Write a protein that binds this ligand. Structure first.
Ligand SMILES: CCCCCCC(CCCCCC)(CO[C@H]1O[C@@H](CO)[C@H](O)[C@@H](O)[C@@H]1O)CO[C@H]1O[C@@H](CO)[C@H](O)[C@@H](O)[C@@H]1O
Ligand SMILES: CCCCCCC(CCCCCC)(CO[C@H]1O[C@@H](CO)[C@H](O)[C@@H](O)[C@@H]1O)CO[C@H]1O[C@@H](CO)[C@H](O)[C@@H](O)[C@@H]1O
Ligand SMILES: CCCCCCC(CCCCCC)(CO[C@H]1O[C@@H](CO)[C@H](O)[C@@H](O)[C@@H]1O)CO[C@H]1O[C@@H](CO)[C@H](O)[C@@H](O)[C@@H]1O
Ligand SMILES: CCCCCCC(CCCCCC)(CO[C@H]1O[C@@H](CO)[C@H](O)[C@@H](O)[C@@H]1O)CO[C@H]1O[C@@H](CO)[C@H](O)[C@@H](O)[C@@H]1O
Ligand SMILES: *[C@@H]1O[C@H](CO)[C@@H](O)[C@H](O)[C@H]1NC(C)=O
Ligand SMILES: [K+]
Ligand SMILES: [K+]
Ligand SMILES: [K+]
Ligand SMILES: [Mg+2]
Lengths: 241, 255
């Protein structure tokens, strides 16, 4: 890649971040202001309903929870075998964590080595998953492409339907399916469920929150890898234009 | 024939990843659970002292109040006292930073959009921004590759005239590549040396620092250069380890 292209893409990225900074402030800062009043009211409500507790003592209890969260414990275990397996999973997938992370010197030393060896290893698995699914999808798309060719239909119409099949696959497993699960377990809206899924499978990560579950995460990460690769290809078309 | 060899590789690497995760779960439990039990007793002792000193509050009420205090802390605003001392996580500067953590896939722990519009925009912004940033990072990688390549060519040409084996030259170049990471991302940036290395590795591999401090952390040319060069350098490190794992896998499968 030429240096002239690198400086142009850098400028587009800086511009895109300014657009992001402007829209996020516009959509999120007024709600945060109103949520400060929600806190103040809920605080004044607690002191009124529990007169034996005063504002200074309530602030002392909040700072203890701050100390606990800073110590790496949310006041159910975080470092049991099962929870440690999911934690090791968020490391090698690069999804990450919020406040629950190693706090010991040895735990930090191991996490550095574990990530450096594990992230390439999981990328190898994910590369193979995407390739296996791509062959399964490619064989299915070939039967549809052969059928539409025999009944004389244009190539532009053939690729248009192939994109609908790809979007529907993502709509079923990563839009509709989690909207049903997260509305039953957590009671979240379709948008709160879809937001959780996009953020997890792009590996941005949600912060702090058996065979079919790990299979869904693997196919999901493979699917969004293909989605972001396709959007990347679309950006190469816009750049050439 | 090649289709059989393609599946045999995915199945074995799946088993190796499952084994790697069982090892990780076992070692993280061994290293972090004793510290967790120790910190939980302190919280339980403090929570029971509160109920004892404040008779008008029960265990059910305190459990409900702590859930709300954690919800606010994780949102980015610690409830102290009128929250006027808590810095907004959604000003132009902070949102610029937030947008960065989205497109780099680093994330920002528990700080995320809390409105419908913010969540809708963040979905579209992520799906479009992550491939866009990937282009900037591949470009930075290509440039740094050309710079380091020309430099290694001069070192190799020097060792060639000094009658040194190809095995020793490749080994020496690996030391230079490793030293390039120690100087720019360990030595160049009260925290200990391990805390500095852990922060760098976790951030630049895009796992993300998470939430170093409760309710988010506080806040240009050299920094942006260090981040871009850093992400590009770690992308190269992980790529090389990936290539090595492909050799090992092929060695076990073909022989
Ligand atoms: C400035 C940003 C922080 C705002 C935090 C607002 C605070 C707590 C304040 C209490 C402070 C105590 C010292 C409002 O408290 C609300 O919490 C709800 C859920 O528990 C309850 O349903 C509701 O009755 C209560 O008023 C938490 O609300 C959030 O809770 C999330 C689930 O954790 C919800 O996904 C989210 O959508 C909701 O907005
Ligand atoms: C952030 C630093 C990244 C550095 C990447 C540099 C790296 C590979 C890693 C070398 C490690 C040595 C222990 C190319 O790496 C990348 O270069 C890109 C173009 O720049 C290519 O597009 C890409 O395909 C390639 O993988 C090329 O280095 C090579 O340069 C040769 C010049 O003659 C040297 O003869 C050779 O000894 C050296 O090995
Ligand atoms: C540890 C040995 C490698 C040294 C690398 C140093 C360097 C010069 C840096 C610029 C000052 C090549 O070093 C030397 O390489 C010679 C060719 O071999 C050139 O003739 C000479 O001009 C150059 O200084 C590259
Ligand atoms: C060919 C596999 C793909 C390349 C990856 C193998 C890697 C280490 C890269 C990791 C760097 C992390 C900062 C070690 O490869 C080493 O393998 C040794 C085997 O005994 C050789 O003696 C040594 O010369 C070689 O560098 C050398 O990269 C070039
Ligand atoms: C009530 O508030 C005052 C002022 O901060 C403080 O001195 C007092 O000790 C608090 N009450 C209790 C029971 O701690
Ligand atoms: K992440
Ligand atoms: K990531
Ligand atoms: K994160
Ligand atoms: Mg804050």
């Amino acid at each position: 890649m030429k240096w002239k292209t690198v400086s142009t893409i850098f400028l587009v990225v800086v511009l895109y971040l300014i657009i992001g900074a402007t829209v996020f402030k516009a959509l999120e800062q007024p709600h945060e202001i109103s949520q400060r009043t929600t806190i103040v009211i809920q605080k004044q409500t607690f002191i009124s309903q529990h007169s034996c507790v005063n504002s200074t003592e309530l602030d002392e209890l909040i700072q203890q929870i701050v100390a606990a969260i800073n110590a790496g414990i949310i006041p159910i275990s975080h470092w049991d075998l099962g929870s440690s397996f999911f934690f090791a999973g968020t490391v090698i997938t690069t999804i990450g964590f919020g406040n629950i992370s190693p706090r010991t010197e040895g735990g930090k030393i191991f996490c550095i080595i574990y990530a450096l060896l594990g992230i390439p290893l999981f990328g190898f698995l994910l590369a193979g998953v995407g390739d296996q699914l791509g062959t399964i999808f490619g064989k299915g798309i070939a039967k549809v492409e052969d059928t539409f060719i025999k009944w004389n239909v244009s190539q532009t119409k053939i690729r248009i339907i192939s994109t609908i099949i790809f979007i529907l696959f993502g709509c079923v497993l990563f839009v509709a399916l989690p909207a049903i699960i997260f509305k039953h377990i957590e009671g979240w809206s379709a948008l709160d469920a879809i937001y959780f899924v996009v953020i997890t499978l792009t590996t941005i990560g949600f912060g702090d929150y058996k065979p079919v579950v790990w299979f869904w995460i693997l196919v999901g990460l493979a699917y969004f890898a293909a989605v972001l690769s396709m959007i990347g290809d679309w950006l190469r078309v816009i750049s050439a234009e």
